[PDB]
Amino acid sequence: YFKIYSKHTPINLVRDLPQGFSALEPLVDLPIGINITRFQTLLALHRSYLTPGDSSSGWTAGAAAYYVGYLQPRTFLLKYNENGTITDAVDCALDPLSETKCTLKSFTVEKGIYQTSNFRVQPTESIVRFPNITNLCPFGEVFNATRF
Amino acid sequence: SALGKLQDVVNQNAQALNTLVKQLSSNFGAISSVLNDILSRLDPPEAEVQIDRLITGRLQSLQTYVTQQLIRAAEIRASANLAATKMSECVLGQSKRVD
Amino acid sequence: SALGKLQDVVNQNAQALNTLVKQLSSNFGAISSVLNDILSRLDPPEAEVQIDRLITGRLQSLQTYVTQQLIRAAEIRASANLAATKMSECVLGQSKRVD
Amino acid sequence: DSTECSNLLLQYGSFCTQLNRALTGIAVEQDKNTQEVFAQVKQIYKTPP
Amino acid sequence: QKFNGLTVLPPLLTDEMIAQYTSALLAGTITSGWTFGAGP
Amino acid sequence: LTGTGVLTESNKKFLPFQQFGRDIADTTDAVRDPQTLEILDITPCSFGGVSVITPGTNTSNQVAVLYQDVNCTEVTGSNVFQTRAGCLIGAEHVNNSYECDIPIGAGICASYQTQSIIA
Amino acid sequence: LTGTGVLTESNKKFLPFQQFGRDIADTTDAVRDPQTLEILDITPCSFGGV
Amino acid sequence: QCVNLTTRTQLPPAYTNSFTRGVYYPDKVFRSSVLHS
Known about the structure:
It is classed as viral protein. This is part of a larger assembly, with 8 copies of chain A. By secondary structure, the first copy, chain A, is mainly beta. Chain A contains 2 helices and 7 strands; from the N terminus they run ββββββαβα. In chain A, β5 and β6 (86-90) form a beta hairpin. Chains A and H meet through β2 and β5 of A and β1 of H.
């Protein structure tokens, strides 16, 4: 299934994405069933002028900007309103504090000290130690014998 | 937060009773945590082996809760005996016992 | 040793931890009590049933220790409550209570 | 340190979190015990030389 | 003693602090009596 | 014999026939390597628990962190402060002394006052 | 949603794609009708001890 | 058709900050005032 979520907001900010939280809500769920690994947006370009043979002369591109974030498997503690609308969220693997918020399952924590997780040191190399053969069996006396 | 001692009992009881409910959605090694599903897709020869795993898991998760409630009830009973002693010796009288 | 009351708590806690760690050398009915060896010479299909046998036994051994530690903590807390009462009523005052 | 064990362990729910929550509660209670016995004095009095 | 998952946390009050508590209690019950546990 | 931990030389002896050690609980604490026939030590590389100090998100979004029981030459860098209960990352140790606000352990307490987190 | 209980109609909000409500501790509490796109409640039909 | 326009522009990618953004309803589930993980 190919899932699409959208949210259309009137903004005033100068160039980049705004700061207020807003929750996307799905449009459609198409049962396509194909593999997707790559994609590309489609633009609308005016033909400002025509040089006879270029085919690529007057393609102006208006004035817009678009962004491509990527989704990663993360745990987000969400905040549902009374009507059912999401209003806030926090990460978990962001920093220790988001980890605190996740662990305690509340959006305001009170002064104290809270255990969140553990940690272990990771091994660095694999060393394989099998008999390399020291006083080798006499295979040089059979396979190299001058007199069979 | 002046009534923290009273609020901790309620919060502990709620947390234990909530963990009791949320153990109803555990496989415990079974294919599915929902009991009619393993009924609806496996024959009685092959269903009992999973229903029995759910039985052991849920019965153990109930035994744990009952034991923890037994331990916590003794603490509340000690607090209640202390409160009865205090009401006797300090509301119904005047105590020479320091502090 | 007239400090036997203090030594008993340390001995009991050390014995509980020693039993807890010596429960890691029990198979509880599986082909081995070491986990890397089960994972090293069995495919995923046939090792899961054996690793689960360790899982249930070790979890049950941990629950036993935790429950008995809660029970022992409930007794150490009663002793510490009595000690606080004695510090309030005998160091900070003079007690009429006999014995 | 065995991921094959840990994924199978998650099927048992929150037994491990429950055990950790039980042990932390009696860990803090030990500090409470010591606080209630000895910390019964406001200030730190001294005897004269 | 740390072997595998086993941890020991330190007491919040070190033995020097507990000794200071008991010394303060014992120096208060000598110079002042029972009066220091009931006021000034 | 697969296994995980640190390796170093052993000062103990074997007898000339012996293959490994085990001090307790079925875990090997030494190996004699197949080729050199040299004895080695096996001891697990460390671990611990992670705690996070907050003065309350009502007051600030600032935190210190304990990593329990690590001589943290092996872990940030915001004035690491090694103590008996771990090492703080995010709090500045001071020479002053106040009442305990947040108990760290082993006599160490943390507090938020002017100006990040003091220990 | 193979469940039991008593069904009364739901007076709340779903999104145009939502199917069923749920309460804390993951217990379904309200449902949608797949032929009439219409939302109902669910609460357990009574039990107890004697 | 199929005119090609990308002659030579090979600028390095520019990045901006997505503060609290791209959060969608990951469920068909209505939920009243709860904090869900």
